[PDB]
Amino acid sequence: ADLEDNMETLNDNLKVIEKADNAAQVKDALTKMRAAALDAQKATPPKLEDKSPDSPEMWHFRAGFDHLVGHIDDALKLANEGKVKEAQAAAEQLKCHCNHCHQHYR
Amino acid sequence: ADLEDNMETLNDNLKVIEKADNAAQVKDALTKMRAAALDAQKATPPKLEDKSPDSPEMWHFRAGFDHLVGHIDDALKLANEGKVKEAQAAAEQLKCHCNHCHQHYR
Ligand code: HEC
Ligand code: HEC
Ligand SMILES: [Ca+2]
Ligand SMILES: [Ca+2]
Ligand SMILES: [Ca+2]
Ligand SMILES: [Ca+2]
Ligand SMILES: [Ca+2]
Ligand SMILES: [Cu+2]
């Protein structure tokens, strides 16, 4: 999967989580998002295409995915406890991080 | 302090950070914001007066301050490293988290 494919997985699964009727459904979507975030973290985005792979910008780009994964893991904790509303609310915290990385790098 | 007073501290100190130029000024304003956020987390906002402490809405209200405080800490670390502009950018990014809670509970 390329970066854009991973981003579609992230986008589609936020919607699945919003519509979910139990916490296990939230968990299944979060699990896919975790893999998509880690795959995306290996990519070089177009806006950084000609910069060095070791550049501060590339490390900052990659760091955004670690924080996103931390949010996914915290939502997974709640989902695995059957706490559907809380897990959905924890997943909504992802959106600002979608926005913030996009502001700088999309 | 009252929830509104804590919100005034958060609001006015964002502007202090935006207009500042040095690490000490940014750090001082972020420190005030952090304390105000921790105190705000203890309140019951007017729109949730009809709710119980373990309601999903109160869980979610408290969780937003946990999140905000974590990102204030990230901004403080940048300020402590002397990265004034990066710390100011992190402070501006807090607004998305402010807005997220407001969309539900303000
Ligand atoms: C950086 C750390 C990012 C995070 C976190 C998220 N996204 Fe992203 N996204 C990022 C880049 C660099 C790009 C541009 C890719 C390109 O090839 O131009 C994108 C793009 C998207 C897209 C559009 C995909 C496309 O066809 O270009 C979507 C729909 C998208 N991103 C969604 C999305 C969501 C929902 C996120 C949070 C859950 C999210 N992204 C995080 C970089 C980063
Ligand atoms: C929930 C987790 C919140 C976060 C994070 C932030 N705010 Fe907030 N804010 C919240 C509520 C429930 C309310 C309404 C309080 C009331 O009694 O009506 C507010 C209100 C404000 C206001 C208006 C103050 C007023 O007199 O009503 C401001 C200017 C404000 N909040 C600012 C603000 C900023 C700048 C934040 C991030 C740094 C922020 N808030 C976070 C709930 C929450
Ligand atoms: Ca493309
Ligand atoms: Ca990875
Ligand atoms: Ca090239
Ligand atoms: Ca916490
Ligand atoms: Ca570091
Ligand atoms: Cu966060």
Per the CB < 8 A criterion, the answer to whether A2 and A43 are in contact is: yes
Q: How many domains does chain A have?
A: 1
The CA R_g of chain A, rounded to the nearest whole Å, is 14
User: CA A45, CA A106: separation in Å to the nearest integer?
Assistant: 8
Pairwise CB contact (< 8 Å): A99 & B96: yes
Of B60, B75, B78, B8, residue with least CA distance to B39: B8
* Helix A23-40 vs helix A3-19: crossing angle, to nearest 10: 170
Ligand 1: lining residues by beta carbon, under 6 Å:
A 3-4, 7-8, 10-11, 14, 45-46, 61, 64-65, 68, 94, 97-98, 101-102, 105-106
Q: What is the resolution of this structure in A?
A: 1.3
CB-nearest partner of B60 from A89, A96, A100:
A89
Q: State the DSSP H helix or E strand holding residue B47, giving kind and residue range, or none if neither.
A: none
Give the residue whose CA is nearest to atom 11 of ligand 1: A106
Q: Which domain holds residue B87?
A: 1-106
CA of A101 to nearest chain B CA: how many angstroms apart? 10
Q: Which of B63, B93, B96 sits opposite A89 (nearest CB)?
A: B63
**Ligand lying nearest the CA atom of residue A7:** 1
Nearest in space to B78 (alpha carbons), one of B90, B68, B66:
B90
Report the residue among B98, B100, B105 best suited for mutation to probe ligand 2: largest number of ligand atoms under 8 A from its CB.
B98
This entry's atomic model was obtained through: X-ray
User: Which amino acid is present at A20?
Assistant: A
Chain breaks in chain A (C to N over 2.5 A) after: none
